């Protein structure tokens, strides 16, 4: 997965 | 849960367009992600790996790299960098 994909999880 | 970043973390957030001194944790995470992404600090192959050794981020985390998957570690960094 992309950086944005992993990071977006922290905003979930 | 409102937070107040210490000078170094605040410098990082402001560097990506944040214009405030008081943040919710989500805002802090949003702007930290923007900073990592814009400075391309993540590994291109395993994009959850973030290299921060020669960057202001390295001084904040006090580590050379970390994984985006380590949520607790990331939260702990923000918390220690709050006033």
UniProtKB/Swiss-Prot annotation, chain B:
UniProt PTM: Phosphorylated at multiple sites near the RING domain by ATM upon DNA damage; this promotes its ubiquitination and degradation, preventing p53/TP53 degradation.
Induction entry: By DNA damage.
Protein location: Nucleus, Nucleoplasm; Cytoplasm; Nucleus, Nucleolus; Nucleus
Tissue specificity: Ubiquitous. Isoform Mdm2-A, isoform Mdm2-B, isoform Mdm2-C, isoform Mdm2-D, isoform Mdm2-E, isoform Mdm2-F and isoform Mdm2-G are observed in a range of cancers but absent in normal tissues.
Annotated segments matching region Sufficient to promote the mitochondrial pathway of apoptosis: 1-76
Segments forming domain SWIB/MDM2: 1-83
Spans annotated as Necessary for interaction with USP2: 1-83
Domain of life: Eukaryota
Domain note: Region I is sufficient for binding p53 and inhibiting its G1 arrest and apoptosis functions. It also binds p73 and E2F1. Region II contains most of a central acidic region required for interaction with ribosomal protein L5 and a putative C4-type zinc finger. The RING finger domain which coordinates two molecules of zinc interacts specifically with RNA whether or not zinc is present and mediates the heterooligomerization with MDM4. It is also essential for its ubiquitin ligase E3 activity toward p53 and itself.
Miscellaneous: MDM2 RING finger mutations that failed to ubiquitinate p53 in vitro did not target p53 for degradation when expressed in cells.
Stated role: E3 ubiquitin-protein ligase that mediates ubiquitination of p53/TP53, leading to its degradation by the proteasome. Inhibits p53/TP53- and p73/TP73-mediated cell cycle arrest and apoptosis by binding its transcriptional activation domain. Also acts as a ubiquitin ligase E3 toward itself and ARRB1. Permits the nuclear export of p53/TP53. Promotes proteasome-dependent ubiquitin-independent degradation of retinoblastoma RB1 protein. Inhibits DAXX-mediated apoptosis by inducing its ubiquitination and degradation. Component of the TRIM28/KAP1-MDM2-p53/TP53 complex involved in stabilizing p53/TP53.
Subunit structure: Interacts with p53/TP53, TP73/p73, RBL5 and RP11. Binds specifically to RNA. Can interact with RB1, E1A-associated protein EP300 and the E2F1 transcription factor. Forms a ternary complex with p53/TP53 and WWOX. Interacts with CDKN2AIP, RFWD3, USP7, PYHIN1, and RBBP6. Interacts with ARRB1 and ARRB2. Interacts with PSMA3. Found in a trimeric complex with MDM2, MDM4 and USP2. Interacts with USP2 (via N-terminus and C-terminus). Interacts with MDM4. Part of a complex with MDM2, DAXX, RASSF1 and USP7. Part of a complex with DAXX, MDM2 and USP7. Interacts directly with DAXX and USP7. (Microbial infection) Interacts with herpes virus 8 protein v-IRF4.
Disease: Seems to be amplified in certain tumors (including soft tissue sarcomas, osteosarcomas and gliomas). A higher frequency of splice variants lacking p53 binding domain sequences was found in late-stage and high-grade ovarian and bladder carcinomas. Four of the splice variants show loss of p53 binding. Lessel-Kubisch syndrome: An autosomal recessive progeroid syndrome characterized by short stature, pinched facial features, prematurely gray hair, scleroderma-like skin changes, small kidneys and consecutive kidney failure, followed by severe arterial hypertension.
Family: Belongs to the MDM2/MDM4 family.
Protein's recorded name: E3 ubiquitin-protein ligase Mdm2
Species this protein is from: Homo sapiens (Human)
Full-protein residues shown: 26 to 108 of 491
């Amino acid at each position: 997965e992309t950086f944005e994909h992993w990071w977006s999880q922290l905003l979930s | 849960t409102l937070v107040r970043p210490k000078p170094l973390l605040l410098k990082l957030l402001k560097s990506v367009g944040a214009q405030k001194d008081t943040y919710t944790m989500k805002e802090v995470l949003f702007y930290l992600g923007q900073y990592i992404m814009t400075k391309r600090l993540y590994d291109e192959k395993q994009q959850h790996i973030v290299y921060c050794s020669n960057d202001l981020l390295g001084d904040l985390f006090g580590v050379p790299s970390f994984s985006v998957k380590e949520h607790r570690k990331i939260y702990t960094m923000i918390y220690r960098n709050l006033v």
